[PDB]
Amino acid sequence: SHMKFTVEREHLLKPLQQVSGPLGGRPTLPILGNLLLQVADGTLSLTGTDLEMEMVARVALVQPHEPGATTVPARKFFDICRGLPEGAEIAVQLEGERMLVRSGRSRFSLSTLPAADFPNLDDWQSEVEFTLPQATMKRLIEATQFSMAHQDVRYYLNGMLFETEGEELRTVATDGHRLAVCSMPIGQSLPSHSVIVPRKGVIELMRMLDGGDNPLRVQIGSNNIRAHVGDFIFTSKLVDGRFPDYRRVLPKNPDKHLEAGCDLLKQAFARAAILSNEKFRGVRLYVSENQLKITANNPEQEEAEEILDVTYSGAEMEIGFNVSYVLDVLNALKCENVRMMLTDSVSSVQIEDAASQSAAYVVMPMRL
């Protein structure tokens, strides 16, 4: 291949870091540890894949260049560019089956694998399309991602539901014990559609957003999703399954409402957690007229007790929770006051910002 390009280190570092995102620490196939490099029509394209998803970055070429393509070890190429001094010019060319990287008096010869062997996701057609600000997509993902399952047997939970309804985009994540749901207006009428993005893809899409002025263009196909922002293109296969209904988890008619300062609740649960069981992380909540008592016990019979002034008018009740799930919600709510909607000791509890209904959190209790 004729491939030749010269680019500033500063214009190459962000693309290299981004496209390397889907790359695992232990590739099963050597090509899976490589980035595909392509020069065509004055543009350098860089691609990284894990076979489920791919991340593409485009770099404008202003210095003399020659079209072509090759694949190069991602980690080594990134480390070389990162290790070069600030303001370095990186001159790249092919010489047989090796890729030469030159900058000042630094010379690097890298092994390559043919661009023709680089794995490509199959062609697909978009069926749903919309544009939204990066900050809106980031908020939807950040507000719910911690509630996704990691390695649940119910494979359809190891990811996030993206649902379009009316003019809103909604994200749902659950692991079967706790759920997170966030809805945002996107100012565009949309058909009713719902898809499951794998958790690895969700994390990839989140990391590519920086909340800047660049809109995010989303394309949803029957088995794939694509997100384009600036010079970056993220594509992933979708999880082929049926996501449960978040609405059946919502407390139907909660008769008990608790309101308290978010940081005050967070610090009390964090201290009580120290003496909670290491495996089960159970804490007991006793709610009475304008008071919350949090207690935690462990097998060593150690005990933590926290008493808080809260706003509470309802019948006295005792309810158990996994303190980590509660802390995850309080950490996700970047607010001053929190509202908790309860029914009884065996039913789900809804937690949200007392001032905003944008995001809602549902935690199932533990039997005391």
């Binding site: 659950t174 079967g176 014990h177 706790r178 759920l179 449960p244 209904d245 059946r248 988890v249 089960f280 996994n322 065996v346 789900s348 549902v362 199932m364 209790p365 533990m366 039997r367």
Partner: peptide, 6 residues
């Protein structure tokens, strides 16, 4: 821990 009624 109780399961969410999914």
């Amino acid at each position: 821990q109780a399961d969410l009624x999914l």
